[PDB]
C-alpha cells in the first residue's frame, strides 16, 4: 500500500512510520513545508502508525532528538514516538478490509487529515487548534498537548483495568476533534476501507 505523506504546515516536520517493533518503509524522513514523501507499507500490516515530529536535530548518522514524537533519537523510526503525537493509525488486509483512524490517546502535536486516495470509504481529520486551546495542566513544555495518561499515570486515564470512562480531559480532545479517539474506550471512529486501499496523510490540512 502506498501512503503519500504531505506536510502542508508552515514549519518543517519529520514524518515517522512504524508498527512498534519495526519501521515501516524507511521509518522517517524530513518534510519541509509543502513537501511530499510516499512510502510503501506491506499488505497485512497490523497496528501501524504515522505521525509528525517537531523541532528535531539529527547528526550525520541519523541520531538526535525531537521535541515531539521522538522515537529513541532516530531519524528513521523503528519504534513509536514520545507523546504528545497525533496518530494516524491503520491495520491493513484484516480479513479483506483495511481499518483506519486518528487518535489523540497519546496527545496532540500537529493537525492531520488521514484519507484514502482510492475508492470506497471516507477519511478522518483532527485539524482544530488543540495546542492553542490545550488545558493548562496538559500543555507540554516541550511543545504540544499531552493526553491525561501521560501527565497523570492513573488507571482511569490510562484505562489500565479496561474499565475507564470519559474524563474532563478526554472530553476536551473529543470536543475539538469528534472524529478522533479521545481515550482508550471511546466510541470508535474507526473507518472500514476496502482491503489494499491507498492513503494520504496530510499534516496541517487546513
From Swiss-Prot:
It comes from the Eukaryota. Disulfide bonds join 9-204, 56-66, 71-77, 121-193, 126-177, 134-145, 149-158, 159-164. SMART domains: THN. Keywords: Cytoplasmic vesicle, Disulfide bond, Signal, Taste-modifying protein. InterPro entries: Osmotin/thaumatin-like_sf (IPR037176), Thaumatin (IPR001938), Thaumatin_CS (IPR017949). It is found in: Cytoplasmic vesicle. Pfam families: Thaumatin. GO terms for cellular component: cytoplasmic vesicle. Belongs to the thaumatin family. Taste-modifying protein; intensely sweet-tasting. It is 100000 times sweeter than sucrose on a molar basis. PANTHER family: OS03G0233200 PROTEIN. This is Thaumatin I.
Amino acid at each position: 500500500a502506498t501512503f503519500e505523506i504531505v506536510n502542508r504546515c508552515s514549519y518543517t516536520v519529520w514524518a515517522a512510520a512504524s508498527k512498534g517493533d519495526a519501521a515501516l518503509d524507511a521509518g522517517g524522513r524530513q518534510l519541509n513545508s509543502g513537501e511530499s514523501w510516499t512510502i510503501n507499507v506491506e499488505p497485512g500490516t497490523n497496528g501501524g502508525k504515522i505521525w509528525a515530529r517537531t523541532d528535531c536535530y539529527f547528526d550525520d548518522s541519523g541520531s538526535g532528538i525531537c521535541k515531539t514524537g521522538d522515537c529513541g533519537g532516530l531519524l528513521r523510526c523503528k519504534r513509536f514516538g514520545r507523546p504528545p503525537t497525533t496518530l494516524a493509525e491503520f491495520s491493513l488486509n484484516q480479513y479483506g478490509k483495511d481499518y483506519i483512524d486518528i487518535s489523540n490517546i497519546k496527545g496532540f502535536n500537529v493537525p492531520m487529515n488521514f484519507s484514502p486516495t482510492t475508492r470506497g470509504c471516507r477519511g478522518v481529520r483532527c485539524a482544530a487548534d488543540i495546542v492553542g486551546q490545550c488545558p493548562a495542566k496538559l500543555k507540554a513544555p516541550g511543545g504540544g498537548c499531552n493526553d491525561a495518561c501521560t501527565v497523570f499515570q492513573t488507571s482511569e486515564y490510562c484505562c489500565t483495568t479496561g474499565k475507564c470512562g470519559p474524563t474532563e480531559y478526554s472530553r476536551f480532545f473529543k470536543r475539538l476533534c469528534p472524529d478522533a479517539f479521545s481515550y482508550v474506550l471511546d466510541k470508535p471512529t474507526t473507518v472500514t476501507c476496502p482491503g489494499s486501499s491507498n492513503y494520504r496523510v496530510t499534516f496541517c490540512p487546513t
